[PDB]
């Protein structure tokens, strides 16, 4: 009886989405997680929820990686990928009761995934990548839903003119930023006494700027800037910026392992401009008062670059709040009417899986879960994806007029990594432990 | 069999709630129907409040009020 394992992988993956679904959207519900040390935490970010779940079942272990895969490809809608895969398997149980094979469902979803991107292409609005005004509106609109939403209008353009490392220290404020063509470090030049060097040559351990008690004194006699205490993350960036290479031996120190720089001084950060080497690099100087503010400031720009990366691959924009999802659930129902075999009943179940996203956002928005999605189906049938769910006001409104936009890559990648992962579960007959 | 005070009133309060819950969904023209069966097995489907209470025959005194 191979149904004993296919039924368990579904219920195991179903329990993960049934929990985290309440944290969907900005107006989602928080959670109360108890850690092994005894303390607890209050956070709604889904990336931290599943990371602390410590799952054991293989079906649920794939959902943790499913969320991490979206974080690298698109970077937005991390929780939306687990909810779709959770709702798809919920519909698959209705199919297995009918006597359908799992492999038949896999190739049927290949057609739904093929027609799934098509529905988003006709509704999406292409845009120009070179137009920075569209890059600023597309970036600043989505940035309002982040934690630091008040200082989003000033952190967005710093990612525009840079397109990339982000330096941050305490003191100052968020509004002030500066783009460095070269590189900047979070270290100091102690215990050197010069602190200002023109005609600099850099070589990672002739060389005037050393990026690593008797050695502190002898290195000062020749007037050589000594900079030590550098972690490995900076070694990968300085090599591509100025063209340096590591020197692991004193005899290996030669002219072929050095660099060059028109200016390398500590204005306490090490502003080193004038790379004068072939490459593509930039460093953004960020300031802030508290430590919790600068950490969120990095995520503000780092999440902003995910939207810039989404516009480069997919030069198109789509409505938010589940607006294009209604068109995806309606048009696939019509395509199934012309199909035959076991593909029609499977494409229909694939559309019902997407109906829960706006129903869940309707729940987290306080509206009725049914009257919200049922009214949008006709608004999209007769209209388009302009109308949708507006969570800021708590009602149905024109999402394009409400200044809410997301790129085409976010919704596309959320469905590809989700459907492909469900097919991996359908291709599992049983699991055995080894040693 | 006797009891008085604060908790005795709660027994009559929570007992009357069960009678209302039995005919809560019958108010209005589009109200739900209810099925009652006698010893002869005759099932009566209706949403009339007076016919429901006439056949329930609750032994509790507070419900008889």
């Amino acid at each position: 009886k191979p149904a004993q394992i296919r039924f368990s992988n579904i219920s195991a993956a179903k329990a993960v989405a049934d929990a985290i679904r309440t944290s969907l959207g900005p107006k989602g519900m928080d959670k109360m997680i108890q850690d092994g040390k005894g303390d607890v935490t209050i956070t709604n970010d889904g990336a931290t929820i599943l990371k602390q779940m410590q799952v054991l079942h293989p079906a649920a272990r794939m959902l943790v990686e499913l969320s991490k895969a979206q974080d690298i490809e698109a970077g937005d809608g991390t929780t939306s990928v687990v909810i779709i895969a959770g709702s798809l398997l919920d519909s698959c149980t209705k199919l297995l009761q009918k006597g359908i094979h799992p492999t038949i469902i896999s190739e049927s979803f290949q057609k739904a995934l093929e027609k799934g991107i098509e529905i988003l292409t006709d509704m999406s609005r292409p845009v120009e990548l070179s137009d920075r005004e569209t890059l600023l509106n597309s970036a600043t609109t989505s940035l309002n839903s982040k934690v630091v939403s008040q200082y989003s209008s000033l952190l967005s353009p710093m990612s525009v003119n840079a397109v990339i490392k982000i330096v941050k220290k305490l003191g100052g404020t968020i509004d002030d930023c500066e783009l460095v063509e070269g590189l900047v470090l979070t270290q100091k030049v102690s215990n050197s006494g010069i602190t200002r060097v023109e005609k600099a040559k850099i070589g990672l351990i002739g060389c005037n700027v050393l990026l690593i008690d008797l050695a502190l004194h002898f290195l000062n006699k020749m007037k050589i800037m000594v900079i030590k205490d550098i972690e490995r993350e900076d070694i990968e960036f300085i090599c591509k910026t100025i063209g340096t290479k590591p020197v692991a031996h004193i005899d290996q120190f030669t002219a072929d392992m050095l660099g060059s720089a028109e200016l390398a001084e500590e204005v306490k950060l090490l502003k080193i401009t004038g790379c004068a080497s072939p490459g593509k690099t930039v460093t953004i100087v960020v300031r802030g008062s508290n430590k919790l503010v600068i950490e969120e400031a990095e995520r503000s720009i780092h999440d902003a670059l995910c939207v810039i990366r989404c516009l480069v691959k997919k030069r198109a924009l789509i409505a938010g709040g589940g607006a294009p999802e209604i068109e995806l659930a309606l048009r696939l129902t019509e395509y199934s009417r012309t199909l035959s075999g076991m593909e029609s009943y499977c494409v229909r179940a694939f559309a019902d899986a997407m109906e829960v996203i706006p129903s869940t956002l309707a729940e987290n928005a306080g509206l009725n879960p049914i009257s919200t999605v049922t009214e949008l189906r006709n608004r999209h049938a007769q209209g388009e994806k302009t109308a949708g769910i507006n969570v800021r006001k708590g009602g149905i409104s024109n999402i394009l007029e409400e200044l809410v936009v997301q790129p085409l890559l976010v919704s596309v990648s959320a469905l590809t990594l989700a459907t492909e992962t469900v097919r991996s579960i359908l291709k599992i007959d049983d699991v055995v432990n080894t040693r | 069999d006797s009891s008085q005070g604060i908790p005795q009133l709660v027994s009559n309060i929570s007992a009357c709630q069960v009678i209302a819950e039995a005919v809560r969904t019958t108010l209005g023209p589009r109200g739900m129907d209810k099925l009652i069966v006698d010893g002869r097995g005759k099932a009566t489907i209706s949403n009339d409040g007076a016919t429901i209470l006439k056949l329930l025959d609750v032994v509790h005194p507070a419900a008889k009020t």
């Binding site: 009918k98 006597g99 359908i100 309606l330 129902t333 009417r337 012309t338 199909l339 035959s340 075999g341 076991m342 593909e343 029609s344 009943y345 229909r348 129903s359 009725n368 879960p369 049914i370 009257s371 049922t374 009214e375 189906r377 006709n378 608004r379 049938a381 | 819950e21 039995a22 969904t25 589009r30 739900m32 129907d33 209810k34 099925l35 009652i36 069966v37 006698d38 010893g39 099932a43 489907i45 329930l56 025959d57």
Partner: protein, 510 residues
């Protein structure tokens, strides 16, 4: 007890138990069921009503499903199993919507909203048969297909002609008022299915009072009495009192005056056939040989009234109130035996288009004859519905698949909470033909949606399903047609069943 979300979840599964059992007995390839009667008797059949009639179930939710059959058999009859499959199939999808958070009232109304869309689509694809001209050619051939889903297919052709003529004789096609009370179904063991007869009148399993009587009465004279022509006796015992030969010789002449009076009274009034309740003795039958007048004996209780309607006779209590008007009318009365069996039923034939016929079924088995009673009564529903509406839609799953798309296409045009009910009513109608393919032993889904492309991509008219193991689909060429009134009632009576269960959310009994 059971209130809120958990109320209908136990009622739906209580109703699904009747659907999942009977969903396999749908179609010509339906799996039969084993009956364990209360008296230990055992039978096997495939009729939907006979299953529900024997299902002694105590669950009240399922008890109301039997009440639907009392009114559906008189109108539909043949599709008794399909209505319950759709009743359970709709409740299956309803449980998916109850978990979403919709009240049962909006679901009961949404199905009534979708049921009218399907009835609207049935009238469109319906094709006339006898429009502006009456004919018996396709009426009998369509009845031959009604009997094809049973074991009586061996001699279905002769049985279809007798059923069609039985309706046209007592009922008129133009008037469109067919009475089932005028058509009685009789049956005796002996013979085969092709040995069926049609008696334009009524027949009772009773012989004459003497073998020397005339076996053929051509006159239109039938005397219907409860007291036969003989010395009067009560219903239990005469008990003539005799002490010795003194009373034996005086009472014999008293009856002698009675034997000569009442026997001669049959000729004074003009009667020929004497249908009496109680039997005659040998003394009374000796004088009937000289009078040349037959008579029936031991006529049962309800057998008296069955003759007064067809022949137009009257029930007379005594021989004193006999007259000419109280005689029955018939064309030819005869006595027909069966090989060596002493049944000798009273064959009364009107020899004309009378308002009462009787179909006498023969066969070498009583259970096959009983199976022919229902297979014939179902044909009357196809004949009666065709008379009321000559239009018809091709059954065998073609209507429901065509009706589902018409409903699914109309679901987008309703911005209301009943939209999900319109989408679920469409998927529930697809389960009736999906059961026909599963009972045929084929892949149900691959056999199901293959017809969807045929009714959309290939051509707009609806095509059938290869259910009878024929060459291919498009059963219009195979002459498998269902009634238009039945398809409208199968979808209508099914919504009424769901409308009665969704509005009940609590059961109470002391």
């Amino acid at each position: 007890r059971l209130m809120g979300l958990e109320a209908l979840k136990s009622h739906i599964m209580a109703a699904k138990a009747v659907a999942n059992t009977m969903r396999t007995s749908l179609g010509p390839n339906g799996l039969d069921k084993m009956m364990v009667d209360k008296d230990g008797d055992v039978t096997v059949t495939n009729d939907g009503a006979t299953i529900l009639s024997m299902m002694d179930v105590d669950h009240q939710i399922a008890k109301l499903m039997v009440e639907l059959s009392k009114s559906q058999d008189d109108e539909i009859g043949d599709g008794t199993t399909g209505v319950v499959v759709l009743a359970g199939a709709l409740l299956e999808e309803a449980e998916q919507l109850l978990d979403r958070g919709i009240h049962p009232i909006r679901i009961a109304d949404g199905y009534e909203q979708a049921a009218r869309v399907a009835i609207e689509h049935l009238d469109k694809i319906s094709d006339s048969v006898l429009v502006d001209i009456k004919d018996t050619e396709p009426l009998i051939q369509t009845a031959k297909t009604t009997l094809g889903s049973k074991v009586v297919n061996s001699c279905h052709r002769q049985m279809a002609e007798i059923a069609v003529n039985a309706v046209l004789t007592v009922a008129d096609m133009e008037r469109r008022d067919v009475d089932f009370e005028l058509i009685k179904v009789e049956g005796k063991v002996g013979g085969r299915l092709e040995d069926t007869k049609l008696i334009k009148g009524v027949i009772v399993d009773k012989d004459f009072s003497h073998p020397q009587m005339p076996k053929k009465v051509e006159d239109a004279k039938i005397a219907i009495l409860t007291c036969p022509f003989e010395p009067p006796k009560p219903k239990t015992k005469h008990k003539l009192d005799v002490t010795s030969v003194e009373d034996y010789k005086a009472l014999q002449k008293y009856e002698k005056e009675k034997f000569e009076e009442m026997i001669q009274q049959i000729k004074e009034t003009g009667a020929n056939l004497a249908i009496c309740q109680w039997g005659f003795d040998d003394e009374a039958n000796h004088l009937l040989l000289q009078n040349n007048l037959p008579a029936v004996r031991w006529v049962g209780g309800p057998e008296i009234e069955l003759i007064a309607i067809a022949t137009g006779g009257r029930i007379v209590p005594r021989f004193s109130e006999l007259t000419a008007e109280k005689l029955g009318f018939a064309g030819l009365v005869q006595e027909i035996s069966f090989g060596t069996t002493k049944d000798k039923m009273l064959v009364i034939e009107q020899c004309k288009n009378s308002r009462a016929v009787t179909i006498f079924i023969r066969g070498g088995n009583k259970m096959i004859i009983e199976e022919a009673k229902r297979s014939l009564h179902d044909a009357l529903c196809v004949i009666r519905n065709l008379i009321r509406d000559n239009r018809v839609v091709y059954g065998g799953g073609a209507a429901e698949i065509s009706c589902a798309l018409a409903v699914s296409q109309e679901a987008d045009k309703c911005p209301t909470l009943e939209q999900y009910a319109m989408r679920a009513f469409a998927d529930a109608l697809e389960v009736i033909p999906m059961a026909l393919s599963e009972n045929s032993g084929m892949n149900p889904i691959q056999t199901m949606t293959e017809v969807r492309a045929r009714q959309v991509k290939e051509m707009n008219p609806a095509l059938g399903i290869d259910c009878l193991h024929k060459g291919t689909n498009d059963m219009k060429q195979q002459h498998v047609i269902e009634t238009l009134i039945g398809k409208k009632q199968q979808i209508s009576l099914a919504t009424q069943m769901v409308r009665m269960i969704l509005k009940i959310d609590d059961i109470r009994k002391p």
